[PDB]
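User: quick one, fold this
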Amino acid sequence: KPERKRVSKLMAYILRHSPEEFGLRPDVEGFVSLNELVNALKTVYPEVTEEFVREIVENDPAGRYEIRGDRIRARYGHSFPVSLDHEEDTESRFLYHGTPRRNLPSILKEGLKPMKRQYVHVSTDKIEALETGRRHGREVVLLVIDAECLRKRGFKIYKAGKNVRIVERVPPDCITLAV
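Assistant:
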């Protein structure tokens, strides 16, 4: 577990934020070559192999990554434009987003915004929404989001991870609770 986490974190940095810093040029869908990713990871962790990367992908509890044949991408979290063909979530009734309490005044005016990312990220799981919020501050609130409000306003909700969902933004009308 302790070797998988460090390598997985570098995988997220390369596939979500700065692939070009490792000489990788993603296609429009966010995929890079699996062999090219392995060599990029080896510049930092020389023991990494293709099999180890496949093990990381297969066992990742959030569904962070996707392999198609010999290509790989992050499924969410990107800070550069990507065209994603994820299935839409039409089943969830409520979604969750944890954020520092200090952001509540701004969020209740503008809704959730993507900030440095392409998409707003939310969750089907309360604990994980709150643990995500806790990365940004100690005093955190749980936002409860009416998923049908989002769909009625035209915002597609995409099944990006096992629990993670992404959407272009969350207007403040779609927030039913702040606890």
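User: anything notable?
Assistant: The chain has two domains: 2-74, 94-178.
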